[PDB]
Amino acid sequence: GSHMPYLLISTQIRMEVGPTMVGDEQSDPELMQHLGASKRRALGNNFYEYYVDDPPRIVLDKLERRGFRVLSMTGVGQTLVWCLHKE
Amino acid sequence: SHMPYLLISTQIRMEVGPTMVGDEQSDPELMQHLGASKRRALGNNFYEYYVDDPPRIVLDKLERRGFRVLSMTGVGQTLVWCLHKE
Amino acid sequence: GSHMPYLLISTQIRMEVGPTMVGDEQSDPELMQHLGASKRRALGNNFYEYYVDDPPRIVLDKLERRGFRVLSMTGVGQTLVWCLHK
Amino acid sequence: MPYLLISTQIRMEVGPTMVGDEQSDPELMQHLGASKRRALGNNFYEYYVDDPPRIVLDKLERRGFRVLSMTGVGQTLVWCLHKE
Amino acid sequence: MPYLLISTQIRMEVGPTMVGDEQSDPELMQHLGASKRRALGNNFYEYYVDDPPRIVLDKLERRGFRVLSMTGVGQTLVWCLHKE
Amino acid sequence: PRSEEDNELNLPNLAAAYSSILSSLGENPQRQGLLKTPWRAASAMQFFTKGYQETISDVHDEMVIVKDIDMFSMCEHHLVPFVGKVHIGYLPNKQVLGLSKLARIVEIYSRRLQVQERLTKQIAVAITEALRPAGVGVVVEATHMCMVMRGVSKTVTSTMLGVFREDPKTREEFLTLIR
Amino acid sequence: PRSEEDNELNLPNLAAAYSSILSSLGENPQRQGLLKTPWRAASAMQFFTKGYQETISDVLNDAIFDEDHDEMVIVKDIDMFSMCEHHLVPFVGKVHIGYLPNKQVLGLSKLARIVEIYSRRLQVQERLTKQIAVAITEALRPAGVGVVVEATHMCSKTVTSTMLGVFREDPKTREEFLTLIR
Amino acid sequence: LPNLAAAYSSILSSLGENPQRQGLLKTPWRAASAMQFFTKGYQETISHDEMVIVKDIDMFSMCEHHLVPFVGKVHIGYLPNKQVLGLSKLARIVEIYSRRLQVQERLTKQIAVAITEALRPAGVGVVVEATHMCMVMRGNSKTVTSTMLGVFREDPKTREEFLTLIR
Amino acid sequence: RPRLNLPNLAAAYSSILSSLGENPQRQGLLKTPWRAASAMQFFTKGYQETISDVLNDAIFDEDHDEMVIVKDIDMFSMCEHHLVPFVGKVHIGYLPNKQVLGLSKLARIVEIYSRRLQVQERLTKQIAVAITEALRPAGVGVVVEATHMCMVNSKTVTSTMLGVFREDPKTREEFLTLIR
Amino acid sequence: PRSEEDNELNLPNLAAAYSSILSSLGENPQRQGLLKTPWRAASAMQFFTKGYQETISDVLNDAIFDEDHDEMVIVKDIDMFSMCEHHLVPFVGKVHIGYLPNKQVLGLSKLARIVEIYSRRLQVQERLTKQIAVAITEALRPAGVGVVVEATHMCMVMKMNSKTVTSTMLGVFREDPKTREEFLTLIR
Amino acid sequence: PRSEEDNELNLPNLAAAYSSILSSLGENPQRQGLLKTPWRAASAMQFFTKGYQETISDVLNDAIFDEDHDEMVIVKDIDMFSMCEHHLVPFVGKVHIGYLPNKQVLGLSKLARIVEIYSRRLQVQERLTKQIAVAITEALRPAGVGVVVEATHMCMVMKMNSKTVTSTMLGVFREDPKTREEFLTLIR
Amino acid sequence: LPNLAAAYSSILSSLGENPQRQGLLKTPWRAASAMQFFTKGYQETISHDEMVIVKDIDMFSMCEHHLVPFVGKVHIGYLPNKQVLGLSKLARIVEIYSRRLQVQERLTKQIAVAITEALRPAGVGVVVEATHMCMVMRGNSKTVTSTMLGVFREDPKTREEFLTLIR
Amino acid sequence: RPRLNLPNLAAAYSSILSSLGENPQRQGLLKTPWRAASAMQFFTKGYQETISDVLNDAIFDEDHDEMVIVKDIDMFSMCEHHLVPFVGKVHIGYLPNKQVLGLSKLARIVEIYSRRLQVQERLTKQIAVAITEALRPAGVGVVVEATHMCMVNSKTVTSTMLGVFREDPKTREEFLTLIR
Ligand SMILES: Nc1nc2nc(SCc3ccc(F)cc3)[nH]c2c(=O)[nH]1
Ligand SMILES: Nc1nc2nc(SCc3ccc(F)cc3)[nH]c2c(=O)[nH]1
Ligand SMILES: Nc1nc2nc(SCc3ccc(F)cc3)[nH]c2c(=O)[nH]1
Ligand SMILES: Nc1nc2nc(SCc3ccc(F)cc3)[nH]c2c(=O)[nH]1
Ligand SMILES: Nc1nc2nc(SCc3ccc(F)cc3)[nH]c2c(=O)[nH]1
Ligand SMILES: Nc1nc2nc(SCc3ccc(F)cc3)[nH]c2c(=O)[nH]1
Ligand SMILES: Nc1nc2nc(SCc3ccc(F)cc3)[nH]c2c(=O)[nH]1
Ligand SMILES: Nc1nc2nc(SCc3ccc(F)cc3)[nH]c2c(=O)[nH]1
Ligand code: NA
Ligand code: NA
Ligand code: NA
Ligand code: NA
Ligand code: NA
Ligand SMILES: [Zn+2]
Ligand SMILES: [Zn+2]
Ligand SMILES: [Zn+2]
Ligand SMILES: [Zn+2]
Ligand SMILES: [Zn+2]
Ligand SMILES: [Zn+2]
Ligand SMILES: [Zn+2]
Ligand SMILES: [Zn+2]
């Protein structure tokens, strides 16, 4: 199907508030720029991430306008993760 | 669609409320329709919308507003539902 | 769509054995009676619940015959929860 | 009997996989190569196989079952299947 | 072989991603660039890649797989895929 | 707030009530050891409630804890002391509190006629409002004299807010570190 | 001694004084938490000074036993709650009592009853320590008595110690008592 | 006070630190006020038949050789002759002498001498237990000093009683 | 650049002795200006070192998949607000990736930052950041427990949890149990 | 492995080096207290490194028992004496071992014998911890193993109060929070 | 006394002897962990014996204070690290010192400096205990001195729980039962 | 009994000791009777909604590999379904299995299995802590064995509760 | 004369296994006759040594006027009445005249007498007599604390005080305080 069909986003609970993690080092830079995301290597991590201040509901609506749909949502530890897909 | 996604939640036990139905930027008309109240709980640096109803009742109300459950998950002691205008 | 479209059921692990929680105080009494459920307020709870002795697989098959389908299943703590829709 | 519940503890790459309760279809249990046992500390019988869950899932697909949901609860991975 | 299970520990942005057990399809494992190992403390072999799960998911989509479910179990994120 | 003028003005009324108590108990307020008691008991009770003279307005990604803060308070039901320790923890957002300032928060609320539950809440609420942090934890451990001078024990009250309530790792860390 | 009639009669006067104190402190005696406080504080202060309603003779009823034992008898860690006569704030702790009988022993609980009648009064720790030792010495005429009070004053720990008879004179006796009360 | 703040500002510069950074701007004044409070004892003047002991009296003093604190506890015992001292006054005696530039030995003696002269008792015992930062911040050791006067010195029973009861 | 001044320090301490109302000429106070100056230099000898100097012969390439902890490291620091000591202990834990640090070098890290005019929060962060940057480990835990003499019984505990020490409940629980 | 013949052959070379050290330190090797020191120090250093004389194979001869035991087995407070390989000064403490068997259990004393073979060498605590865990994992193929070493290093004390704790968690001791918590509670 | 020049001169001879020991034990002196060991062990052994570089005279420079103090002075829990002269293995523990002055007192830190000069040598606990007591007696001429050393000998542990306590009681600490009892109570 | 005494008399001779000296004359019989008492368990047969725990149950057993005692404590916990077991019967179960030639692992399992089969509870927890002379008299170590069944195995809250409450 | 017999011991232990009603052929009991025999030989290896062997390189002529104590010496003995262990600790003290004993040799003295079929009273006396005869000191103190397995919480304490440890109250008090 599409180039780069899957997307993983996350937030720590509480879900009503950000930050929302929206990407890894190899994420599409144009989509990251569209979401207003910033790239950082948080202290203690050996990898870069893209994040936004927005709560996940706002990011989900933006991704819908980019052709993404939520396939699955899960909890892991204190993290809420959404798996999205674009045709 | 306008504002297609919705997140709602409740703590265990699922048979009883409150059910969290929104954040500060939630649609005020939908919050009013659900009979929700806005509050900043002590210890939180954000406002939330909640109802006294258990989640089964909120889910039925959201179905009549055109929403469909896409996913349900547990995180800590919280049950979360992700809904989409379907 | 239908009157009371959503249903939440649960069991504690192990999933092979009951009880299975099948309702809250505002649950459809006819569906609760059909499942052979009993209403109780467990000590320590400030709410009534409907439960059956059956493991969840048996309740799921009964709900299928009532027009319900599983939309989602999740774990929260030691609880397995199923979200069904008619 | 449209619904089926199966499970495994972490790690998912290795069995046993729990495939049934006392009231499970004996022919499906026999087809999966399952054995019935009451593990020490349990007051119920279960059916299990040595296979990891991926192998059980492929076998259930050939019997007309489809995965509706998969979830974690404690250290257990559970799959809910429906006969299509 | 319609079903596939993959996993990663938190953080999801970084690998390794577990992509198979001893009985996994060797051609699919080779296609993903996976290596086989028996990690110390384990009594089973596993296939893994250095890639984060988002990259493995895109590769599996090009092999005809689709995510049916995603779940968390302890610190592990698991995806259940089906060849559809 | 209560002023030092209010204290001077009410000191003779307090001493008169304590002199009345000495005579109602069957004691002799004229004996050597009890002569200055009405004024010593009145000054002591004013000192034990000096927190009414203060207002809260007048007074990094890591968990900050100040543990074993000595606490002396007065039972409002029986007017007998309850004494112990306060352990405070918080995870700051953008502002931190001076280490001595939280002992000053424990002081303003504890030096009053109290119930341990209200005291614990007041400390947590004051820190939460002053700093708006990610979370706060307040644990008070005390011996109540109205329970010990009658047959029986320690009372422990615990307020967990924000991430101290929501995150099991955060709450466990705070409870381990305060031992 | 103070009677239960004196207590009933003086309870309203005590409650009135405690109501006056709540008002003089700047507090609101009408709030939920202080409504019953004049009566609760008055009843508590009567209970704390209940030692005035009993005499040493009442305590000694069925307390003496004629025995030929020849051994040191100790009752240690007796909980003690007294009231400071200077500030009307409690001083609390423990009393350790030892004695070497001559021809009479006391019932073990009666040693605690002696700590009770003197400590449940407006006191100074030194007088309390002496009163306990004097009461035991006079009730039994023993070869020796040791009384150690350890207390925290709500107004550092205060320890007072009375050593009489062979507890004062014999180094072996005093050392034995002090080791055994650990 | 300004002379003390000027010396602390000089120390801040001599150590290689920037006395203009946010965290150090008010340090010359705070250190000067702290050192005045630690030496507030220079502002004050000293003007039954049972063993009386007040143990675990908290003590904070300043080493006169290194100007680093020494902290710990004081245990006081006495056998009165005619007059007894109010419990709070024993701690006030501890306070006047400890809040000065001291050596633990002089501090211990000053407390014992003050009690002996105020009461003329049959005996006095003073034990100070302290941790010296001048020894710890250099490289677990504690200093214990003990003054035994009158019957506390002469009578083995009396001295043993005091030492057992202060534990 | 990292850290002559001894007579300037002694002169300031002699001035302090006089300003307090004490006679600097008495036997016990005669050598005090020099002893206090040498003590204050030793308490701030962390300004003479760099993290690079500490890391000489400190790194070892090893395949160790285990939690490494050095607990009860004595710590002596100076409050930057009042110039009075704050003393206690540091407990450090880390989960290595491909490099381990010499056990004594963890204490040397505590030494460089604590021997300065400090605030406990900054000190805790500096130790964790130095370990993280020297080894790039899967995670770090730093807990400092101290008594502040400016406050004159209460203890301050600061805790930094990074990487897997922050994210994994099992890892954080293991570290906190093992440091007791 | 090192043999008793290698020990006899190298004992005079060890004693000669220790005699040289006594002289190089400024001491008098002829005084009463130092007279036999070259030989006593050499024999002591051979004993401290006696682990090089053993193999994991001989330590595990008839140490294995086939049993159907589903329970956590722990041997805690095993005294441990090792030698720092960087400074040649001892590091001493305790080892706590836990494991969840499947088809085989090890004789309780054999777990201590494993601690002995690896600790009686020139070591670093991290390597010692790993070697014990690897030996147990390979000898039994259990569901999980936990190894915790707590030690005082004389090259760090000669600061003085500091202890080094190393911890290896494998299999279910790594994966299951309940298993790891159970082991850590039971060893304390 | 030993000088820093003697140390520089003997450091290569010490490193050569430690390199020889590494080879004689059956170890590989070329492996990563043993590479610098000859130099680290040599510098460590020089530091452990740094007491030979000092004299009691320089340790007591302006340590004496003429004072009229009639009280027992104790410094307890002084950390002590020494080296066994028979086996070249450490013995470690604590020293507790007490004294009753007459015309002179010693600076509290100087008592620890006395423990340092004698313990940082090849020793036997009995000699170390005596040397500390003799140094205090000679420096102050007090009414009495007490010295108690408590230590764990690594050549006895490598049984494991055993501690050695040595105690010197001089002057009034020997003669007066009240003085000796007071010191022994106050050090515990 | 005489066969046991004959073997103990043989052991006394094989050790290099004189079985005719005063202190050893009755030893073959005393050792034989002691070994019979230590193995008296071979003479016996096994035939609410709150956590119930009986902790610190004294335990004395015999190592089957070395014939030297292993001694310690047993801590038992269970969550009943319908029937509860009398407090003294839990110690009687401990007694039947411990008074035999054992290995701590088998002993732990036998106790847990006996409780599980007698009550069919929601869960059982059995922890044995013991000192083995076969390890101590050779060269501080303790052996801890732990069986967790039912909800004690599955539920982290239940297992944590039991382990905290047995301290 | 001080202490072939291993097969005779193994045969007796095999006989015991059978006489108890146990099957000697089960997996856990197969090597037991030999393991029990080797254990009982090790528990009685004190019969293989003489006090003269222990005193080799043990005496040192020294002018030490001090009390020397070795406390918490682990002790494992065998009851001669029931052949069940009695275990505990030994605390030894002495005041030398002109000779001191190597600290480890005091433990070796405990080892020779305790590794035999014993009664705690005889064991205590043998240790004190050996020290007295080897050094001729001004005094000796020997305290043995043990748990007897034949009794199956109660502890037995035996104490020998000789010379100045018996006569001088200051000496005895000093020893008893220092062994705690
Ligand atoms: N030591 C320690 N440090 C910690 N820092 C945190 S940040 C949590 C957080 C807060 C706000 C937010 F938006 C996202 C995440 N949590 C900690 C903890 O539990 N312990
Ligand atoms: N346990 C114990 N029993 C005791 N019986 C006595 S008889 C009085 C007596 C008379 C004269 C004398 F010189 C010493 C004691 N004194 C005892 C004691 O001190 N302890
Ligand atoms: N508790 C306690 N009370 C005590 N009262 C005394 S009066 C002794 C006395 C001794 C000598 C002298 F010239 C005059 C008076 N001594 C006591 C004691 O040692 N302990
Ligand atoms: N003892 C101990 N050892 C441990 N090693 C680890 S590796 C974590 C990890 C590494 C890579 C990855 F992909 C996922 C998780 N975690 C441990 C722990 O919590 N305790
Ligand atoms: N005491 C104790 N015994 C244990 N046995 C196991 S088997 C792994 C396993 C298998 C099945 C199951 F349902 C849960 C755990 N795990 C244990 C543990 O964590 N503690
Ligand atoms: N604390 C303490 N101080 C002490 N000062 C001395 S002077 C010797 C002496 C002189 C005169 C006298 F009457 C008794 C003792 N001995 C002391 C002691 O044993 N303890
Ligand atoms: N004190 C205490 N009482 C408790 N009662 C329970 S019933 C749980 C249960 C869990 C799973 C299941 F399938 C059926 C019943 N659990 C308890 C506990 O953990 N602690
Ligand atoms: N530490 C300590 N050292 C001691 N040295 C001795 S010599 C006794 C003696 C020797 C010769 C003599 F003529 C009279 C008394 N006794 C001591 C003691 O009790 N403690
Ligand atoms: Na969030
Ligand atoms: Na709810
Ligand atoms: Na269930
Ligand atoms: Na599995
Ligand atoms: Na990952
Ligand atoms: Zn009350
Ligand atoms: Zn008072
Ligand atoms: Zn100093
Ligand atoms: Zn400060
Ligand atoms: Zn080293
Ligand atoms: Zn030695
Ligand atoms: Zn054995
Ligand atoms: Zn016996």
Numbering used by the authors:
A (entry chain F): -2 to 84
B (entry chain J): -1 to 84
C (entry chain I): -2 to 83
D (entry chain H), E (entry chain G): 1 to 84
F (entry chain E): 58 to 116, 126 to 218, 223 to 249
G (entry chain A): 58 to 212, 223 to 249
H (entry chain B), L (entry chain B): 68 to 114, 126 to 217, 222 to 249
I (entry chain D), M (entry chain D): 57 to 59, 66 to 214, 222 to 249
The authors write:
In the presence of GFRP, the inhibitory effect of BH4 is boosted and occurs at lower, physiologically relevant BH4 concentrations. It stabilizes the active or inactive conformations of the GCH1 decamer by direct GFRP−GCH1 interactions and by enhancing the binding affinity of allosteric inhibitors. In the presence of GFRP, the Ki of allosteric inhibitors is decreased by a factor of 10 (16).
Guanosine triphosphate (GTP) cyclohydrolase I (GCH1) (EC:3.5.4.16) catalyzes the conversion of GTP to dihydroneopterin triphosphate (H2NTP). This reaction is the first and rate-limiting step involved in the de novo synthesis of tetrahydrobiopterin (BH4). The effects of GFRP on GCH1 occur via formation of heteromeric protein complexes between GCH1 and GFRP, which are dependent on the intracellular concentrations of the effector molecules phenylalanine or BH4. GCH1−GFRP complexes consist of one GCH1 decamer flanked by two pentameric GFRP complexes.
